[PDB]
Symmetry: D2
Subunit: 273 residues, 4 copies
């Protein structure tokens, strides 16, 4: 039962391989903050031997008001990914909402993300399947692990088979997320052993709890980990979804590699019988 590998450049993402980091920041506030954030990742990733794909959003469609911070935009934003790639030479992942945005970005970046709310948007899977780029499918909180067969299948059809699944937790009554550790196996199984990644930040909201959560995730064994940081977490340890104090990256990423390695090399165990 050998794992499907998804390769973002030299980067080999798979559930049996050493874990990839899709770290970064929520939005592209400024380049000035983008570059400083990307700095700490690349330095600490490269030091600690952790494959790295940078992540920031150029657009927002989940603002609370209309006359809020949309963000850079499709046009202004892609230049800031040009200027980061050359300066640091890392792979960039960003979310895409409108179908028309799909091709523009697949050129600029390496991994495109399918936001959870739009996971069941065939108009967007169609148009994002076209690009031929590596897809990150965020697993909707309101969709069960087994239902992720259909979204991978829809991608297959559109031609694109370079797909990652990202668990960002599941609705647990009102205004609460829980992470179903069992979900990861089910998403692997139903996905032709596609790479599963745990979006630990977006699986929190209602902390010190980033740590304990992401360990548990990694101890299952995953292809990668999706995290967001901030130098001063919007002030509160949580910029909307719970952002990690940038400073604490290394001693945290220490803990994750330590588990990912201890776990990834394990006399394959079958409690089945």
């Amino acid at each position: 039962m050998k794992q499907k590998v998804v390769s973002i450049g030299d980067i080999n993402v798979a559930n049996d391989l050493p874990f990839v980091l899709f770290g970064g920041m929520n939005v592209l506030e400024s380049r000035d903050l983008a570059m400083r954030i990307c700095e700490h990742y690349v330095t600490v990733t490269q030091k600690l031997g952790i494959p790295y794909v940078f992540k920031a959003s150029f657009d927002k469609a989940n603002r609370s008001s209309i006359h809020s911070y949309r963000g850079p935009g499709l046009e202004e934003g892609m230049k800031i990914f040009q200027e980061l790639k050359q300066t640091f030479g890392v792979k960039i992942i960003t979310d895409v909402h409108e179908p028309s945005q799909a091709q523009p970005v697949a050129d600029v970046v390496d991994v495109i993300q399918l936001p959870a709310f739009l996971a069941r948007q065939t108009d967007l899977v169609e148009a994002m399947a076209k690009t031929g780029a590596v897809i990150n499918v965020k697993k909707p909180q309101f969709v069960s692990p087994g239902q992720m067969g259909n979204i991978v299948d829809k991608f297959k059809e559109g031609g694109n088979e370079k797909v990652i699944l990202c668990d960002r937790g599941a609705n647990f009554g009102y205004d609460n997320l829980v992470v179903d550790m069992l979900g990861f196996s089910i998403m692997k199984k139903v996905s032709g052993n596609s790479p599963v990644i745990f979006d630990v930040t977006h699986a929190l909201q209602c902390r010190a709890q980033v740590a304990e959560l992401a360990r548990a995730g990694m101890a299952v064994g995953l292809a990668g980990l999706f995290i967001e940081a901030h130098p001063d977490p919007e002030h509160a340890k949580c910029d909307g979804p719970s952002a990690l104090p940038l400073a604490k990256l290394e001693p945290f990423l220490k803990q994750m590699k330590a588990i990912d390695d201890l776990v990834k090399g394990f006399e394959e165990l079958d409690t089945s019988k």
Copy 2:
């Protein structure tokens, strides 16, 4: 505490008024089936004294595969609403996905629907607020009743205050919906007493159970009821979301008016103290 009224033509939708029906069919399969479906509504509505707004979808973005039945389309579909309005003289409600579709439809139809998955899509609320049309906001299964303040507020901002809220149940573990009867009061309260409607069909999936559910809903007291029917329910009593056997409309709508009336005229009761 007098209710906010939303008027679709002569039709006055409000939580204290006699209940409006937003009945119809899932997709516009053919006009031949559209018109026959619309027939039974108009005849039974008009007989039974139930304000009526017809509902069918022109587009689908919730297909399971890409090379599936998209449906009529934005262009072919709107003609079939022209040809229904003149022939039957009823108000048409349809869902809208892409932001560009918003203005085209607000002309053709009376009520536009904001699909649950895209409820947190500011690009679409913005563009749908513009039209100035009556909005039906489907309440996401993964969003709590109190959170519906923000979506009504976002609509206010964009200029549009002619907004209905539609409960289509809430995620209850994996692959299961429950309807929180308490939700209706909370959505009223937080919405400036906006009209709340119960999408009974879309709150089912995993029946004979359409009946018992929609009673319970109506006994709370609601502005309206959102239902879909079929002559032969795709064969199974459930065309995706659980469709009502068209024949059983009258003896069912009998039951709903009977509750809506008994309830709507009630020495206002305060169990608060």
Copy 3:
């Protein structure tokens, strides 16, 4: 599909019959308050043509601290049921925890209640099946409607078939209950059409919301309704589980009979096909 009837004296409890009230108070604080509470029920029940079974607890095992108000006790409590029966001539229902309490009470009272937490306690079902009394099984928040087959079956075995099921809601994430209106049909079906009753008070906790909830329940159509009141609801409209302001009984019970009747006589509808 004629309903199983359960007869508490002259009182005929069944899902097709006019609805029975199992109204009352949480604990037997004093007789002085017991009798005053029982007064308002009997007067308003008898006025309004609503079969009535009084309910109060003699014991508590759900106190928050040990050195709290246990309540009257097995010995002191049963005398206060003697003194209520003679004075008012109504049927008394009380909960039972220890297996040894089962026989003592089945003599003193008419209906014994199986508390939710102990629903899966064979030692207690065995001993409560023995009595031959009418059982009220509270449906655990953590047990699904279909699982109520097994508890009715366990009762059958022990000899006792005079069993009512009481829905008191279901766990909905942390520290939250939801009532699944669909549950009532499933509990009927799996229970040999046993009488289902809705414990509206105990299905609330986290109100004005008693009203809207109990309507919805009744509009499904039920054998009965389980409620608790207080003259001054411990001060807050909610003595632990949300207690109804005693004064508002009539104008509330007005609303319930009005639905129970409108519903109970209904050209039986099959949305199944």
Copy 4:
């Protein structure tokens, strides 16, 4: 923030200490199977350097029918714990239902367990607080982590402060459990840093999934792990709650110690700021 330690003989149970195993079997089927089961534990525990407390139930009150296998019984069962202690010299933990059973067992055994369904039974906490024995409180699926303050407090009152908390998952819609990894921190915090243990077997039901689950649990860092095994898992890898194939103990317990150690020694990390 040093951890509260609970000492079962020489055995020191605490969230910072190396993890204790509360392994064993569901019921005492026969001594012949009891002793063979206990054999494999003691051999593999002792080999692998894992503190061990054996667990089996003498009684069952969660049978599906009345005329089912009650089990050994309070009298016949305690002799089989005598005969295991002497032969193997390990600490025995068993569940207790009736209040009268509490003192008898606290003599025979080292750790008594408070079953989840009876966690809110003051009559049993009172009587189990008396014994002065080490308590294992199973955390009800229908009770949230923060609510575990009250049960520890109730134990304090009755005199007994030698209390362990055991997470056995939480209700996740109908007939489904999820384990909230975040729960462990909250139960620690609210419990005066009491020892938290993860009942991995009882957190499954609806497997190969025992493995992935218990890793995740341990990677959080816990005082101990509660598991049940069988030579031939009732035939299916799951004797009611999902039992572990006895043979696979070592290569599984290998994995758990490997995480417990890697985790337990960790430059304490604060993602809080």
